[PDB]
A and B are shown apart, each in its own frame.
Chain A
Amino acid sequence: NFMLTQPHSVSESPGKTVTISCTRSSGSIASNYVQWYQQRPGSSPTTVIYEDNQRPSGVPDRFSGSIDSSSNSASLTISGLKTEDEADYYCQSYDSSSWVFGGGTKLTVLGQPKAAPSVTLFPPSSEELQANKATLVCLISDFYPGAVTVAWKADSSPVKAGVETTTPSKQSNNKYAASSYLSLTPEQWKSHRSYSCQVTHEGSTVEKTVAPT
């Protein structure tokens, strides 16, 4: 019956008072109780707010929650953002007493200056080609914060088919890396003048270029 919509990402530095909205598409948000869950990377989720505004015992005092009937939305507010607060957050409510979840929000605690990604792009090896395969291998490292968008070009035409991309993972220096693969047949690989891996990070692109010649 209804979708619950959250912002895909929200990002602020520590100390800030930060809010995540959760908008109900049909029916008053005030009709059913709203819960919020926190899920840290690679951990099980926990409940940080229940019944619109109730805070479980162990949850830190900085967590609160409210309803805004004029925006038909519920809100999770963190008063004094801390690094351990970095997580995905999910709102949820009830339809036919079936539980509806929000899409989730990625909350980044900006704990260090912005760093543009290093890009490295490998063409298919002659040995892989001999195996009748061709893979373009694009490696992305040393970026902060940990979100990039990857686009692939054949000459200047875009390509979406045969692209697999990993989600960023933390490195030893607390910055991020990711990778992206473009799978081609050897015929496709030699049928273009060049190929490009383009990584957009915080609005700016870093690219490498590779050519069969």
Chain B
Amino acid sequence: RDKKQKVHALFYKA
């Protein structure tokens, strides 16, 4: 969902 989507877009690195 959207709030989790947002933190992924902020923080995700492989």
Contact = CB atoms under 8 A, between A and B. Distances in A.
Q: Are A and B close enough to touch in the complex, i.e. CB under 8 Å?
A: yes
B3 interface: yes
Query: For the complex, would chain A's binding face be called helix, strand, loop or mixed by DSSP majority?
Result: loop
Interface in B1-14: 3-4, 6-7, 9-10
A30 B6 CA distance: 12
A108 B7 CA distance: 33
Interface residues of A, number: 7
A122 interface: no
Interface string A17-50: 0000000000000111100000000000000000
A94 to B, nearest CB: 7
B1 to A, nearest CB: 11
B10 A97 contact: yes
Contacts of A32: 3, 6
Interface in A41-97: 51, 94, 97
Contacts of B6: 32-33, 94, 97
A31 B10 contact: no
A30 B1 CA distance: 12
A51 B7 CA distance: 10
Contacts of A94: 6, 10
A67 to B, nearest CB: 10
Nearest to B11: A97
Given A30-B3, A31-B3, A94-B10, 12 more contacts: A32-B3, A32-B6, A33-B3, A33-B6, A33-B7, A51-B3, A51-B4, A51-B7, A94-B6, A97-B6, A97-B9, A97-B10
Interface of B: 3-4, 6-7, 9-10
> Nearest 10 A-B pairs (CB), nearest first?
A97-B10, A33-B3, A33-B7, A32-B3, A32-B6, A94-B6, A97-B6, A31-B3, A94-B10, A33-B6
